Structure 1
Amino acid sequence: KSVLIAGPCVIESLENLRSIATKLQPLANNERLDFYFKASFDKANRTSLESYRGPGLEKGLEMLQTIKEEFGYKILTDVHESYQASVAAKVADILQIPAFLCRQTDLIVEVSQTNAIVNIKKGQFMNPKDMQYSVLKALKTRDKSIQSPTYETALKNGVWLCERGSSFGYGNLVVDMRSLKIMREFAPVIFDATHSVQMPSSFAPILARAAAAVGIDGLFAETHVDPKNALSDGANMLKPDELEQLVTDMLKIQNLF
């Protein structure tokens, strides 16, 4: 079953969380998908001190927990610092490690000590073959006998890799589709269709179709019921309708192979 992770960039309020969770219900009920609801409790590196951060760890987890209970959703959130992982894992089913923190030992180990699936985002500065090292830190934390990171062992141990593109000069990200294949030797691979498009959004669907054809284990895409009124990533988020179309296309492509 292919994975879909979807939800808003940041936790905005419980009411907005409920609205988007409600519009995701058809997709959450799709028998061909293993569905996870995403929302960030903290935006840690916004442009300005004044930019919206979200509710922070304790209140954010509370809100995600309410969504888990109200909708029966599995939950993904990202962590940023040590000492968040064990607390966040009581609520989140997947704990995502941000792209810039993908080589951070202590964080990888701490998240991997929890019961959560670990989703490690590949830094835009990384050679995909070098992601084997962060997979291995996570694997060794879970089974100390493991010497080499393979897809089968990583799947067994809930350790995933996530493609979000690579730095292509200044203010541009390029998705090297070769990386989807390279990384999948080491771990299941999720393609992030939201944060991989930077051109110095309309491309999210076509990149996701390409990724589905190459071969991936799932899709990450941020979604919001009224993106123009979003507090974070508003310009890059899909309408639930648009997300549905993209998933339909993914599933048709995957049904060929």
Structure 2
Amino acid sequence: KSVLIAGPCVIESLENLRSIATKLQPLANNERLDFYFKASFDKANRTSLESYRGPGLEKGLEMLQTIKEEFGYKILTDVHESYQASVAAKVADILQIPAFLCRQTDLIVEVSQTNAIVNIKKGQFMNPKDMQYSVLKALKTRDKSIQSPTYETALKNGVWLCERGSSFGYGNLVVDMRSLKIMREFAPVIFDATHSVQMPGGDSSFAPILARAAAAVGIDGLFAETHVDPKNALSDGANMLKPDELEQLVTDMLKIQNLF
């Protein structure tokens, strides 16, 4: 199975979560996919003090648990701070470490101490080669005998890497497709199609093109933020896909992967 992680940027309300969960039911039911439903309980990095932050740890977790029970979905959420991981892991099947915390050893350790799959997002500032050290920190936490991070050992112990592009001047990200190959020597690689676009004069219309490229290089899965009505989303409305758009991207991924 190829992994598909999909859902809204942030938890906006239980009824929006149900609405997107419903629209994702077809992808969730697809035999070729290992599906996880995603939603952040807090947006720590917003541009303004007034910006919507999410329901927070306790309330957001209750809502995601509701989705898990009503739709039967496995759950992914991100953690930003100490003492969140153990609480979140009771609900979340995957715990994601955000790109800017990708070298934060205490957080890597804390998450790897839970039963969750660890998804480590590559910082836009990182050499892909250097992500091996983040993987090894997680692997040593689960199995102290491990000395070298490799794909099979990382797969076995539930430690994955996620590509979201690299800084390219100011306010531009580029996806170095070579990074998918380099990183996959260390761990299963998920491609983040929605946060890897940013261009001066950002534009989600590139997300499908990058996803197709990525699938052709070789990836273990796809991460894409999706929302039933992006123009009325509370965060990242410009980059998020509608469910129909996501379905096209996934269809193309599967057709490419079925060649190789």
Task: Name the TM-score, length of structure 1 as normaliser.
Answer: 1.00
**Per-residue Cα deviation, 1:27-83 (whole angstroms, up to 9, x for no partner):** 000000000000000000000000000000000000000000000000000000010
Partners of 2:2 and 2:58 lie apart in 1 by: 31
Partners of 2:97 and 2:141 lie apart in 1 by: 15
Partners of 1:99 and 1:8 lie apart in 2 by: 18
The CA deviation at 1:223 is: 0.3
The CA deviation at 1:246 is: 0.3
The CA deviation at 1:95 is: 0.1
1:209 aligns with 2:212: yes
Partners of 1:102 and 1:26 lie apart in 2 by: 32
The CA deviation at 1:182 is: 0.1
The CA deviation at 1:231 is: 0.1
The CA deviation at 1:127 is: 0.2
The CA deviation at 1:251 is: 0.1
Name the SS for the 2:123 alignment partner: coil
Counterparts in 2 of 1:1-257, with a 5 A limit? 1-200=1-200, 201-257=204-260
The CA deviation at 1:128 is: 0.1
Name the SS for the 1:186 alignment partner: coil
Name the SS for the 2:6 alignment partner: strand
- What percentage of residue pairs aligned between the two structures are identical? 100
Unaligned ranges ≥5, structure 1: none
The CA deviation at 1:247 is: 0.1
Unaligned ranges ≥5, structure 2: none
The CA deviation at 1:4 is: 0.1
The CA deviation at 1:218 is: 0.1
Partners of 1:115 and 1:234 lie apart in 2 by: 32
Partners of 1:45 and 1:3 lie apart in 2 by: 27
Name the SS for the 1:61 alignment partner: helix
Name the SS for the 1:95 alignment partner: strand
The CA deviation at 1:157 is: 0.1
Partners of 1:159 and 1:82 lie apart in 2 by: 19
Name the SS for the 1:4 alignment partner: strand
> How many pairs does the alignment contain?
257
Partners of 1:135 and 1:101 lie apart in 2 by: 13
Partners of 2:229 and 2:162 lie apart in 1 by: 26
Name the SS for the 1:24 alignment partner: helix
Name the SS for the 1:50 alignment partner: coil
The CA deviation at 1:86 is: 0.1
Name the SS for the 1:66 alignment partner: helix
The CA deviation at 1:237 is: 0.5
The CA deviation at 1:154 is: 0.1
The CA deviation at 1:135 is: 0.1
Partners of 1:161 and 1:169 lie apart in 2 by: 24
RMSD of aligned Cα (Å): 0.2
The CA deviation at 1:168 is: 0.1
**Per-residue Cα deviation, 1:75-97 (whole angstroms, up to 9, x for no partner):** 00000001000000000000000
The CA deviation at 1:205 is: 0.1
Task: Name the TM-score, length of structure 2 as normaliser.
Answer: 0.99
The CA deviation at 1:166 is: 0.1
**Per-residue Cα deviation, 1:156-175 (whole angstroms, up to 9, x for no partner):** 00000000000000000000
